[PDB]
């Protein structure tokens, strides 16, 4: 995955909605004779939300491209192409360079296939 700060945003605006979830427990539950336990649920949110925030900071800790220099990270990609673009046809040239011998060598395997057939029937 990537753009994981947005995944953190999933723990921001959506957590902001979680505050809205926390909101809906006091509409009329008081004098209409638990909410005391719901306060412990508020403590549970004090745990959860804040720890989620800590998690947010932890993913802040390792933002990809810590060098943060696209102006030069693209240059990194330029050097990487200075490798790869050279390697392209070179690595694939080996294929034909091999088959030019090895196909006929395989037919040689077929010729000793002839002789194997000779061995089949003494």
């Amino acid at each position: 995955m990537a753009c994981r700060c947005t995944q953190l945003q999933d723990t921001i605006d959506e957590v902001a909605t979680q505050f809205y979830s926390s909101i809906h427990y006091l509409s009329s539950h008081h004098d209409f004779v638990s909410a005391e336990e719901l306060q412990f649920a508020q403590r549970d949110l004090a745990k959860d939300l804040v720890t989620k925030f800590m998690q947010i900071d932890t993913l802040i800790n390792q933002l990809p491209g810590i060098s943060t220099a696209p102006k030069h990270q693209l240059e990194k990609i330029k050097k990487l192409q200075n490798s790869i673009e050279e390697k392209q046809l070179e690595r694939k040239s080996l294929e034909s360079e091999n088959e030019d011998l090895k196909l006929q060598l395989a037919k040689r395997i077929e010729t000793f296939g002839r002789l194997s057939c000779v061995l089949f029937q003494p």
């Binding site: 192409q81 790869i84 673009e85 390697k87 392209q88 046809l89 694939k92």
Partner: protein, 203 residues
Amino acid sequence: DADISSLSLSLDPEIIGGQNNFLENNLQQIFQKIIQERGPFRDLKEEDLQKELQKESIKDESSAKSSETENVLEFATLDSKRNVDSQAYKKELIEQIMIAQTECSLALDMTSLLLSKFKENSIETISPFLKSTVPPSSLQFSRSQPPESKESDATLAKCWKEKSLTSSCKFLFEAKERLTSVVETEHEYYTELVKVKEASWPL
């Protein structure tokens, strides 16, 4: 970046990169391209070697032919789309009767959907897929309208009958032709049978 062409392997990191090898691939191929019949093709395998010889000698040393450009080359394929019997009568008959008769099966089925609102001994005849799907008693009639009428009714009602009776005329006359010709043919047989029986010969 030729590796972008090698990103087809990255597409193979995004896909199975086709089934590739298959005997069935050799079957559509048994249909596709020259020639046919893999045994006969094997007989042709030396001739196939000839195909790899001077048969492919044609190359490129000629005018670019601007007239061929560009998407109009496909328009030539459109020219192919335009410019380019026993059983077959019965065949196409199977076609037409298939269409009409199965449509009538849909008549029976949907009318069964209508009559399934009451009696259950009607929906039973519907095609098997339907009962598996839509529950019976679904269709229902509505009371509505004369509904409309037009002159084309009476006009076609006349002209079509005219064409019909005239078709009967053409039928009787051309059949008169074929029958008269059959007489013309058949008579020779029994004249030669005058040469037979009227000359006293076994029959």
